[PDB]
């Protein structure tokens, strides 16, 4: 997360980091959303490699074992049928993990609420971005959990041609772009979090910024729509 | 554009 502070800890618990096995160790790849005690969602972009995941739950502080972490490995790899790996704007970048065992709910780990199906935000619509992404263009994985406000910016001004023309879809959500903050690498799969109603609803995934860099004026940080994939979440569950 | 990841 690129212009944003660190979170209060265990503030956004339903918030994942996704690690891939790597030598003696794990390595972050990736944020995603708890949505049931047993799946995750996340981007399908990084899921793309068929390596050893695991899910972190709890999490804060990726170097320091806290004490509210819970660790599961991913048994299920359920990425959208209609998603190309070579074709990123034509959307439908969403994947949902189910882990080996159920994680044990509790202040630190929490379900993400989602969206009603069809749900869309007004422009200018309250939202935060999370996650241990860089915290500058082409600088550092952030330790602790970043945030950063991130307002949405609707779908007629980010498809249109001084932001990201056809390349953004109705079924994606824009946010940012005033070229101050964003999401950055190591955020993908991650949630953005809008409020509505006063209560916070996990309306994107991070998906994608411009090839130029993290924060870019006129290229808000895409996230695949969540509120078009209701249907298909529930579908996966249920048959899995 | 560039996915969110490394470097997809
Ligand atoms: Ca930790």
Redesign the interface.
């Known amino acids: 997360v690129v212009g944003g502070t660190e979170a209060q800890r265990n503030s956004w618990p339903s918030q994942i980091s996704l690690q891939y096995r790597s030598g003696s160790s794990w390595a972050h ?2 944020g995603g959303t708890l949505i049931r005690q047993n799946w995750v969602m996340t ?1 399908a ?2 899921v ?1 490699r068929e390596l050893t995941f695991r899910v972190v739950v709890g999490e804060h502080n990726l170097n320091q074992n806290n004490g509210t972490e819970q660790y599961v490995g991913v048994q299920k790899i359920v990425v959208h049928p209609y998603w190309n ?1 070579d074709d ?2 034509a959307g439908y ?1 969403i994947a949902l993990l189910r882990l080996a065992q159920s994680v044990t709910l509790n202040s630190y780990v929490q379900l993400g609420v989602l969206p009603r199906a069809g749900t869309i935000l007004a422009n200018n619509s309250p939202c935060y971005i999370t996650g241990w ?1 860089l915290t500058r263009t082409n600088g550092q994985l952030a330790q602790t959990l970043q945030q950063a406000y991130l307002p949405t910016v609707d779908y007629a001004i980010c498809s249109s041609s001084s932001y990201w023309g056809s ?1 953004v879809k109705n079924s994606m959500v824009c946010a940012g772009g005033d070229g101050v903050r964003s ?7 991650g949630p953005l979090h809008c409020l509505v109603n006063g209560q916070y609803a996990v309306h994107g995934v ?6 130029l860099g993290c924060n870019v004026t006129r290229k808000p940080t ?1 996230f695949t729509r969540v509120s078009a994939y209701i249907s298909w979440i529930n579908n996966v569950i249920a048959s899995n | 554009x560039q996915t969110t990841e490394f470097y997809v």
Request: glycine letters at 16%; proline letters at 0%.
């Open positions: 790849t990736c981007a972009h990084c793309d790996t990123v704007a970048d992404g390349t999401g950055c690498q190591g955020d993908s799969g991070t998906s994608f910024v411009s090839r895409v």
